[PDB]
Design an enzyme around this catalytic site. Sequence first.
Site, PDB file in Angstrom:
ATOM      1  N   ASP A   1      -0.261   7.171   1.390  1.00 18.51           N
ATOM      2  CA  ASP A   1       0.737   6.527   0.514  1.00 18.51           C
ATOM      3  C   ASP A   1       0.549   7.044  -0.912  1.00 18.51           C
ATOM      4  O   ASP A   1       0.451   8.265  -1.120  1.00 18.51           O
ATOM      5  CB  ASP A   1       0.659   5.008   0.696  1.00 18.51           C
ATOM      6  CG  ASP A   1       1.698   4.254  -0.117  1.00 18.51           C
ATOM      7  OD1 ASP A   1       2.847   4.148   0.355  1.00 18.51           O
ATOM      8  OD2 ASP A   1       1.363   3.751  -1.225  1.00 18.51           O
ATOM      9  N   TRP A   2       0.501   6.176  -1.923  1.00 15.56           N
ATOM     10  CA  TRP A   2       0.351   6.653  -3.289  1.00 15.56           C
ATOM     11  C   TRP A   2      -1.006   7.284  -3.541  1.00 15.56           C
ATOM     12  O   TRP A   2      -1.145   8.063  -4.489  1.00 15.56           O
ATOM     13  CB  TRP A   2       0.630   5.517  -4.264  1.00 15.56           C
ATOM     14  CG  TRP A   2       2.077   5.353  -4.486  1.00 15.56           C
ATOM     15  CD1 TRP A   2       2.864   4.287  -4.118  1.00 15.56           C
ATOM     16  CD2 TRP A   2       2.949   6.301  -5.100  1.00 15.56           C
ATOM     17  NE1 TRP A   2       4.165   4.518  -4.485  1.00 15.56           N
ATOM     18  CE2 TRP A   2       4.243   5.739  -5.104  1.00 15.56           C
ATOM     19  CE3 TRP A   2       2.753   7.555  -5.693  1.00 15.56           C
ATOM     20  CZ2 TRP A   2       5.339   6.400  -5.651  1.00 15.56           C
ATOM     21  CZ3 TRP A   2       3.849   8.213  -6.234  1.00 15.56           C
ATOM     22  CH2 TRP A   2       5.121   7.631  -6.215  1.00 15.56           C
TER      23      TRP A   2
ATOM     24  N   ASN B   1      -0.434   1.641  -2.027  1.00  8.35           N
ATOM     25  CA  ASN B   1       0.104   0.322  -2.354  1.00  8.35           C
ATOM     26  C   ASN B   1       0.386  -0.480  -1.088  1.00  8.35           C
ATOM     27  O   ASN B   1       0.997   0.055  -0.152  1.00  8.35           O
ATOM     28  CB  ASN B   1       1.405   0.499  -3.130  1.00  8.35           C
ATOM     29  CG  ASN B   1       1.909  -0.802  -3.717  1.00  8.35           C
ATOM     30  OD1 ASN B   1       1.129  -1.573  -4.267  1.00  8.35           O
ATOM     31  ND2 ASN B   1       3.211  -1.060  -3.585  1.00  8.35           N
TER      32      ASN B   1
ATOM     33  N   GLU C   1       1.118   9.221   6.107  1.00  5.59           N
ATOM     34  CA  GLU C   1       2.138   8.385   5.473  1.00  5.59           C
ATOM     35  C   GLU C   1       2.177   8.642   3.967  1.00  5.59           C
ATOM     36  O   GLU C   1       2.073   7.739   3.136  1.00  5.59           O
ATOM     37  CB  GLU C   1       1.950   6.910   5.833  1.00  5.59           C
ATOM     38  CG  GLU C   1       2.337   6.582   7.292  1.00  5.59           C
ATOM     39  CD  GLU C   1       3.839   6.451   7.491  1.00  5.59           C
ATOM     40  OE1 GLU C   1       4.525   6.018   6.548  1.00  5.59           O
ATOM     41  OE2 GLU C   1       4.345   6.774   8.591  1.00  5.59           O
TER      42      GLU C   1
ATOM     43  N   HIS D   1       3.361   2.003   8.956  1.00  2.00           N
ATOM     44  CA  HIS D   1       2.930   2.631   7.709  1.00  2.00           C
ATOM     45  C   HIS D   1       1.429   2.485   7.495  1.00  2.00           C
ATOM     46  O   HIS D   1       0.770   3.440   7.077  1.00  2.00           O
ATOM     47  CB  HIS D   1       3.704   2.065   6.516  1.00  2.00           C
ATOM     48  CG  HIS D   1       3.288   2.648   5.202  1.00  2.00           C
ATOM     49  ND1 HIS D   1       3.591   3.941   4.827  1.00  2.00           N
ATOM     50  CD2 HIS D   1       2.568   2.119   4.184  1.00  2.00           C
ATOM     51  CE1 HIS D   1       3.089   4.178   3.627  1.00  2.00           C
ATOM     52  NE2 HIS D   1       2.454   3.091   3.220  1.00  2.00           N
TER      53      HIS D   1
END
Length: 296
Positions: A107-108, A40, A131, A273
């Site tokens: 991330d996701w 995201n 991350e 990030h």
Amino acid sequence: ATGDEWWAKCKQVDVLDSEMSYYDSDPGKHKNTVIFLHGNPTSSYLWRNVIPHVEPLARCLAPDLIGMGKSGKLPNHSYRFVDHYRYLSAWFDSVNLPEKVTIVCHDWGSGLGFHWCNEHRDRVKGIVHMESVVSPLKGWESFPETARDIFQALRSEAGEEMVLKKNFFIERLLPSSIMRKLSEEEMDAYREPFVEPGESRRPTLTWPREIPIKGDGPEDVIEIVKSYNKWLSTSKDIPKLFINADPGFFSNAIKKVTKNWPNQKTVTVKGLHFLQEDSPEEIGEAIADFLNELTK
């Protein structure tokens, strides 16, 4: 470089009751294969400068998660982790993959990828993560202080105006976690899936609401992450590469959570990030080295 140029290299396939867009460097081939999973509020475009370092060694795939990039928008506006996993799992079964694959995830995309690996353990030849969502958060105290107020606001009733009306994740959080300044063309590629105010932006609001925070929720994501964390922490036969971002956002916490994970190597690159925007060359080279080690 443009969104148009990147998506011109991608293809679309019907998946379940919608469609997904994805990059595929060698459709249908069962040679060494690597799948890149964004999170995201990005898309497969996130990997555009990493993939060229890996393609010479592997078929490279990079899907846009449902509701994101050039993938379809869902008319019930339901984009929880389980919805994304339903779509991503169907996508894996639609693109003619070889018996084992390497997952590169962020991330996701790591939440989805780690879960897919946990449910398909005999299909996994390696995992590169960065991350990433490696464990539930024990509480809000463990969320980084500089972002804690924002994410509590996103998870409150204020989230709808922040995201659906003002596009907060694209316009504020994304550039805040890139060290360089994106060009207009790069920023527009990230904006493109979310140009229309309203429910088109729902994926970028539901994602922060899925962060597994102990004592808060959501309980279903907490259980999923606990389960794959248990598997990963004893996965001595799965080679893993953690790409640590300096200074990163969650990287420092991931280093501690995964310090005793077996069969994991770490490489460090410069980034916050969205490290792929600051160190794509070193990230791609690290993945290529990791793949070569598997081939020996």
